[PDB]
Design a protein around this motif. Structure first.
Motif, mmCIF file in Angstrom:
data_model
loop_
_atom_site.group_PDB
_atom_site.id
_atom_site.type_symbol
_atom_site.label_atom_id
_atom_site.label_comp_id
_atom_site.label_asym_id
_atom_site.label_seq_id
_atom_site.Cartn_x
_atom_site.Cartn_y
_atom_site.Cartn_z
ATOM 1 N N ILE A 42 -21.355 -12.624 13.668
ATOM 2 C CA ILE A 42 -22.040 -11.480 13.081
ATOM 3 C C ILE A 42 -23.166 -11.974 12.167
ATOM 4 O O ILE A 42 -24.328 -11.647 12.405
ATOM 5 C CB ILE A 42 -21.053 -10.573 12.301
ATOM 6 N N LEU A 46 -27.193 -11.122 12.408
ATOM 7 C CA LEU A 46 -27.995 -10.487 11.367
ATOM 8 C C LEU A 46 -29.132 -11.381 10.878
ATOM 9 O O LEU A 46 -30.262 -10.918 10.738
ATOM 10 C CB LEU A 46 -27.122 -10.059 10.181
ATOM 11 N N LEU A 148 -14.273 -4.657 15.332
ATOM 12 C CA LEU A 148 -15.207 -4.639 14.208
ATOM 13 C C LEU A 148 -16.543 -4.032 14.606
ATOM 14 O O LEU A 148 -17.025 -3.081 13.986
ATOM 15 C CB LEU A 148 -15.430 -6.057 13.688
ATOM 16 N N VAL A 151 -16.342 -0.384 15.638
ATOM 17 C CA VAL A 151 -16.149 0.498 14.494
ATOM 18 C C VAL A 151 -17.458 0.665 13.726
ATOM 19 O O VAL A 151 -17.814 1.785 13.332
ATOM 20 C CB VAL A 151 -15.052 -0.047 13.544
ATOM 21 N N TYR A 152 -18.195 -0.434 13.556
ATOM 22 C CA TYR A 152 -19.539 -0.350 12.997
ATOM 23 C C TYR A 152 -20.368 0.657 13.763
ATOM 24 O O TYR A 152 -21.026 1.503 13.162
ATOM 25 C CB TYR A 152 -20.250 -1.707 12.995
ATOM 26 N N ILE A 155 -19.377 4.299 13.332
ATOM 27 C CA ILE A 155 -19.749 4.726 11.996
ATOM 28 C C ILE A 155 -21.242 4.954 11.812
ATOM 29 O O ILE A 155 -21.638 5.961 11.237
ATOM 30 C CB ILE A 155 -19.299 3.686 10.967
ATOM 31 N N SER A 156 -22.073 4.039 12.299
ATOM 32 C CA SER A 156 -23.510 4.224 12.160
ATOM 33 C C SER A 156 -23.967 5.429 12.971
ATOM 34 O O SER A 156 -24.916 6.118 12.606
ATOM 35 C CB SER A 156 -24.265 2.967 12.595
ATOM 36 N N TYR A 158 -22.033 8.258 13.752
ATOM 37 C CA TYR A 158 -21.631 9.451 13.012
ATOM 38 C C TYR A 158 -22.570 9.661 11.833
ATOM 39 O O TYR A 158 -22.997 10.769 11.570
ATOM 40 C CB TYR A 158 -20.188 9.359 12.520
ATOM 41 N N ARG A 159 -22.839 8.580 11.108
ATOM 42 C CA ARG A 159 -23.694 8.579 9.922
ATOM 43 C C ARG A 159 -25.107 9.084 10.204
ATOM 44 O O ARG A 159 -25.594 9.989 9.526
ATOM 45 C CB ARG A 159 -23.752 7.169 9.329
ATOM 46 N N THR A 160 -25.758 8.494 11.200
ATOM 47 C CA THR A 160 -27.129 8.852 11.562
ATOM 48 C C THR A 160 -27.197 10.188 12.296
ATOM 49 O O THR A 160 -28.267 10.782 12.431
ATOM 50 C CB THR A 160 -27.775 7.764 12.432
ATOM 51 N N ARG C 64 -33.822 0.934 9.892
ATOM 52 C CA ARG C 64 -33.327 2.208 9.382
ATOM 53 C C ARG C 64 -31.860 2.135 8.985
ATOM 54 O O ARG C 64 -31.487 2.538 7.883
ATOM 55 C CB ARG C 64 -33.520 3.320 10.417
ATOM 56 N N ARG C 65 -31.028 1.609 9.879
ATOM 57 C CA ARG C 65 -29.645 1.330 9.527
ATOM 58 C C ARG C 65 -29.323 -0.135 9.756
ATOM 59 O O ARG C 65 -28.182 -0.560 9.567
ATOM 60 C CB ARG C 65 -28.699 2.181 10.363
ATOM 61 N N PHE C 66 -30.322 -0.907 10.178
ATOM 62 C CA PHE C 66 -30.168 -2.353 10.225
ATOM 63 C C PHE C 66 -29.911 -2.852 8.813
ATOM 64 O O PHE C 66 -29.175 -3.815 8.614
ATOM 65 C CB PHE C 66 -31.389 -3.036 10.841
ATOM 66 N N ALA C 68 -28.622 -1.092 6.452
ATOM 67 C CA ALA C 68 -27.289 -0.553 6.224
ATOM 68 C C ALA C 68 -26.261 -1.436 6.903
ATOM 69 O O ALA C 68 -25.133 -1.575 6.433
ATOM 70 C CB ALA C 68 -27.191 0.878 6.732
ATOM 71 N N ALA C 69 -26.660 -2.017 8.027
ATOM 72 C CA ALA C 69 -25.774 -2.872 8.795
ATOM 73 C C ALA C 69 -25.549 -4.167 8.035
ATOM 74 O O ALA C 69 -24.430 -4.492 7.682
ATOM 75 C CB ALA C 69 -26.354 -3.154 10.173
ATOM 76 N N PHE C 73 -22.060 -5.318 6.387
ATOM 77 C CA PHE C 73 -21.430 -6.570 6.768
ATOM 78 C C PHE C 73 -21.151 -7.408 5.529
ATOM 79 O O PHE C 73 -20.027 -7.878 5.347
ATOM 80 C CB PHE C 73 -22.318 -7.333 7.762
ATOM 81 N N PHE C 76 -18.285 -5.927 3.849
ATOM 82 C CA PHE C 76 -17.086 -6.157 4.640
ATOM 83 C C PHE C 76 -16.518 -7.537 4.335
ATOM 84 O O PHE C 76 -15.314 -7.697 4.141
ATOM 85 C CB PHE C 76 -17.385 -6.010 6.132
ATOM 86 N N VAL C 106 -11.447 -3.392 6.800
ATOM 87 C CA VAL C 106 -12.067 -2.520 7.788
ATOM 88 C C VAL C 106 -11.902 -1.083 7.316
ATOM 89 O O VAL C 106 -12.851 -0.300 7.332
ATOM 90 C CB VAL C 106 -11.442 -2.682 9.192
ATOM 91 N N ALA C 110 -15.126 1.090 6.145
ATOM 92 C CA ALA C 110 -15.339 2.249 6.999
ATOM 93 C C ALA C 110 -15.314 3.528 6.179
ATOM 94 O O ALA C 110 -16.146 4.419 6.361
ATOM 95 C CB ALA C 110 -14.286 2.308 8.096
ATOM 96 N N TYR C 113 -18.440 3.939 4.180
ATOM 97 C CA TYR C 113 -19.571 4.349 5.005
ATOM 98 C C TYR C 113 -19.444 5.760 5.573
ATOM 99 O O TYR C 113 -20.437 6.343 6.007
ATOM 100 C CB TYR C 113 -19.785 3.346 6.140
ATOM 101 N N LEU C 114 -18.235 6.313 5.572
ATOM 102 C CA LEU C 114 -18.044 7.641 6.148
ATOM 103 C C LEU C 114 -18.162 8.771 5.124
ATOM 104 O O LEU C 114 -17.497 9.800 5.268
ATOM 105 C CB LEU C 114 -16.687 7.734 6.853
ATOM 106 N N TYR C 115 -19.006 8.587 4.110
ATOM 107 C CA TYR C 115 -19.172 9.587 3.050
ATOM 108 C C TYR C 115 -17.829 9.948 2.420
ATOM 109 O O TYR C 115 -17.275 11.007 2.710
ATOM 110 C CB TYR C 115 -19.869 10.836 3.589
#
Lengths: 245, 246, 246, 245
Positions: A42, A46, A148, A151-152, A155-156, A158-160, C64-66, C68-69, C73, C76, C106, C110, C113-115
């Motif tokens: 990962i 990145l 992992l 799930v990321y 989540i991204s 649902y989020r976006t 945009r969410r990179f 965030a990614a 991470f 995490f 996790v 999670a 990130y899920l509000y």
């Protein structure tokens, strides 16, 4: 008709990834088991991307166009070269034989294609990467990596999506990426101890992934909602665990 | 007739090759180089990509004359290696030889920056180009160079065909660097052959001139073409002709 | 009275310190750290500068969410170290312990990130913060930490005085990161003291709370002030008070 | 009155550079003679700057402001610290003594000054860098470095002037830089074998530089034309060679 096409694309990538598994460990060598391996993976992705983008923001008219052409050429070198010349094999005119091949392909890939060509080449590359990581270790760091990543994604997604309920190239890249992901459980579970019609639990993972993609394309046509990876990743996981018991 | 006009470029070709040989000699008297592996062309290419990335991040971060400074320095150094190699084979390890080359390179680079005579520019371009040609030609052997050449040529033809098609699409359906640079490319194969009055590698030199002939022919015709495949393909043609000789 | 309102931040202080101690314990059961040199604060600071540079080049190149990614991470992982340390001291080297922490992290990340519930955010901020606090506090000894603190405080007061004066000039003459971060700073001195029910380093903890008191006092007054010198200067005050005790 | 001020600034920088020479080799260590040393130096400067700028283009609101504050703090650490604590010396409260000092200075330097303060601090730093490189080797790589740099300057000057005849911070930075350059011949010639009123040829270089700056400020008031460095660099060189014979 492509309704079968993209599952076909998957099946093929998985197959060629297995076919590549044998000649691939004639050197191979990327990354013991170690569950820290997915994390290293990962972080590698990145930082790799972050760099690649800063290469765009510092390029990239003829630069990153070419730069990509080169990276592509190398990975295609390894594909044709290492996997076919050792599978002949090995050395001499065979090695030369594949150089001509890979130069041909990247040249073919560059300039303008024709429908099936890009899909084919993508399938090849994908099978390559799949094979490499799947070999590069066992079905448990892989399991965690998969769940992992998936799930990321969910989540991204649902989020976006929830970030909506207010008010070209990367597509093919990402496509290839999802094409790649379960194949890693198929190779990396082939590197595991049963062997019916050639490794039963890896079959399990493979079919589980094919049904995963089926369900995904269904919800995809249902309209909008599809948490990308968790169908194929997690479903290939279910299929693997189903085929292992 | 059409002699004096646009013969200066085949002139520059021959010259660069000659000076590349004459530089083949002194450059080993202090080594340099950088394994006849076929991966060497790949390392070459990648390092070239790093070279451009550096040059570009340098330009976009400019640097009104900082860029001029950075390149002026790079030039100064490569000229130090050229001259250096000359006197160090000549008068050898002596202080007056080395100091000779430092003073030489200061003179030359200063001249080039002081708005020279710009026939001068072509001449220096020839010097530099011959230099690089010599370095890589001294560096490893033909078959890798052959691969490098054919590769680069393929890249070129892809690039040309692409932007040209992008011309034929968009209706309704600093150059010297690239110049002297492609002046260099086949010559590197000319060196890496006499390194492995001259050999049967004259053949490569003439074949390269004939490639250039086809090139300046099509260029002096309407509706242009690719570049490298005549020069490389022709130098390779002549070189392989210089195998069927001995 | 004015209890329940804005006591949550001294609450968060005490909590972070406590959880930092409780984390002092398990983190050595697998080492971590990173020489009681006074150069260590300097290495710290410089590495911090590299950390920001990375975060910024990451943001401006977003993503945009990179972005965030990348941060998701990072989060995490740091949570993996937190949880990891917990179970690995708890159930120890067992598979169910490790898997326990992976599943844990996790779940937590999670959730965030899920509000979530965003009282939750403060709580997790406390966890993370205590984590970092524990790490560096476990890492090397007071006097370097003391230097680090006083240094950082000085930087702060310079920065505040500067932009404030830049307010008083311009007429005519994501915050949580910084928040929980300064929540961390003096606590690192609280750890690196019990590491060298508690000691006479309670003193540092109370003194840090009193610093925070002065801080939330002036903040709840008109015309703000600097930040660090109350928290650090007060934690240092209490710590040095906890020397005159034993 | 500052007509003497800036030459004063030079004299002082040279002096403090010499005063720093002794405690500086209590460690020191930057860069044998080797004329390749000036080239390594130049390339180091160009790459350093290129990076620093890409740091600006990637920063630099609170970043490079702070980043500079830090670099400044370190170099001031070495100045106060290494040069005074060893000159006491060495260790213990003295080392602490200078930390307080340097934190004070950079803090003082940051925020807003008052005329003489910036000049003073600049003089200090300058003497530091001068001392360091002058120590870091002998008067011949230094000679070549000087004449190289100077010739570059004169050329870029003429060039950008001729580029005209058509139709804030960096100033202080560059100022310090020219303040620095001849001092390198003074230190690096003090690291050389005579010793009248304490090293005669280094005196020669020093006065030659003072007259160099005189001539420069004269032509500077003559109007526009001044090829920056070649006055002080080359003139300090003449003075050195005059004081060595």
């Amino acid at each position: 008709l492509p309704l079968l096409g993209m599952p076909l694309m998957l099946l093929f990538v998985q197959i060629i990834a297995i076919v590549l598994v044998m000649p691939m460990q004639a050197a191979g060598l990327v990354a013991p088991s170690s569950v820290a391996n997915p994390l290293i993976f990962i972080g590698m992705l990145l930082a790799f991307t972050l760099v690649l983008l800063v290469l765009l923001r510092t390029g990239g008219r003829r630069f990153i166009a070419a730069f990509i052409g080169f990276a592509l050429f190398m990975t295609f070198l390894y594909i044709f070269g290492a996997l076919s010349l050792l599978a002949l094999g090995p050395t001499t005119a065979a090695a030369a034989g594949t150089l001509i091949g890979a130069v041909a392909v990247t040249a073919l890939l560059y300039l303008y294609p024709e429908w099936y060509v890009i899909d084919i080449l993508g399938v090849l590359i994908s099978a390559g990467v799949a094979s490499i990581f799947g070999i590069s270790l066992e079905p448990l760091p892989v399991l965690v990596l998969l769940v992992l990543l998936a799930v990321y994604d969910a989540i991204s997604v649902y989020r976006t999506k929830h970030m909506i309920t207010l008010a070209e190239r990367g597509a093919f890249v990402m496509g290839m990426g999802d094409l790649i992901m379960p194949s890693i459980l198929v190779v990396s579970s082939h590197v595991f101890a049963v062997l019916w019609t050639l490794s039963a639990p890896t079959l399990g993972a493979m079919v589980g992934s094919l049904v995963g993609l089926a369900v995904l394309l269904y919800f995809v046509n249902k309209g909008n909602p599809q948490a990308g990876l968790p169908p194929l990743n997690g479903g290939a996981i279910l299929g693997f665990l189903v085929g292992a018991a």
